[PDB]
Amino acid sequence: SLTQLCNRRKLWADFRAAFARAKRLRQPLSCISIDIDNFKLINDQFGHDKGDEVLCFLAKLFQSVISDHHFCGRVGGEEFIIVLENTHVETAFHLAEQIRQRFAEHPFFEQNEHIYLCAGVSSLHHGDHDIADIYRRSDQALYKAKRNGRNRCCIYRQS
């Protein structure tokens, strides 16, 4: 049911309803973009079923680390998005870091392979009119994180 909790279609719709709800209720709304480092190498070396185990563990990890309500979506081959209602961006950043760390700390497969991820974080801003305004910022923070290597987290700033 991890492929059910991280359904891409449901994610975007839940995210859009959350955006409108967030503006209407004036609540903070945070967004984390995650990309698994070297996921292609993992599938090349261990195969598709094992690559899938990694994805599954990461989804399980989201639940364990984020006890409060949240939406998840696998939006690309190895990219996830987490949407956190009524959550300030710093709290989301801290959650993102915990996910990064526990993923890096989990040994995988008979040979205790270590796998890493990067994350970018942002949240609803006043001038926003679409979830794409938020995703653009978390996506950019993700790629900013990736500039310094694997296993990195960044919060978006306009600075």
Side-chain angles (χ1 to χ4, degrees):
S1 194
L2 26 91
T3 83
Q4 283 176 337
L5 297 171
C6 286
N7 182 262
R8 178 169 50 78
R9 180 181 213 130
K10 277 153 195 176
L11 183 280
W12 294 125
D14 285 337
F15 195 2
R16 287 192 175 279
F19 183 103
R21 198 153 57 228
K23 279 174 126 57
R24 173 172 66 88
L25 304 174
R26 295 172 298 137
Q27 297 172 349
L29 176 63
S30 290
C31 180
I32 305 163
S33 297
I34 287 171
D35 194 68
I36 299 171
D37 292 304
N38 302 124
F39 192 66
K40 297 183 191 75
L41 168 66
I42 290 297
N43 285 271
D44 289 346
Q45 179 187 3
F46 299 94
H48 183 86
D49 283 357
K50 273 179 188 190
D52 281 4
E53 287 178 356
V54 179
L55 297 170
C56 282
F57 175 85
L58 181 56
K60 289 188 290 288
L61 192 52
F62 295 160
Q63 288 179 249
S64 169
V65 170
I66 313 171
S67 57
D68 283 327
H69 188 66
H70 66 269
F71 306 111
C72 170
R74 188 194 181 188
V75 294
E78 77 255 1
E79 187 188 328
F80 290 83
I81 182 170
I82 303 168
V83 173
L84 301 169
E85 293 194 80
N86 204 28
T87 300
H88 293 289
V89 69
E90 278 84 1
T91 303
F93 180 78
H94 291 327
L95 295 173
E97 282 290 0
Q98 290 184 326
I99 293 158
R100 180 193 55 72
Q101 280 163 338
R102 285 198 54 200
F103 189 74
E105 286 161 352
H106 182 82
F108 283 98
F109 318 138
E110 191 276 339
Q111 65 188 88
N112 298 317
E113 181 83 358
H114 286 272
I115 311 177
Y116 306 90
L117 62 82
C118 289
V121 187
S122 194
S123 68
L124 174 71
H125 293 185
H126 290 299
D128 293 347
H129 305 115
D130 195 273
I131 54 166
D133 288 316
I134 302 181
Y135 176 75
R136 170 183 181 270
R137 290 189 300 261
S138 65
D139 190 32
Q140 192 192 104
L142 167 61
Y143 280 75
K144 188 185 313 164
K146 291 173 71 75
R147 294 312 275 179
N148 288 278
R150 62 182 187 187
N151 194 31
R152 298 291 192 272
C153 281
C154 275
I155 187 168
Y156 179 92
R157 293 306 178 194
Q158 184 72 273
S159 82

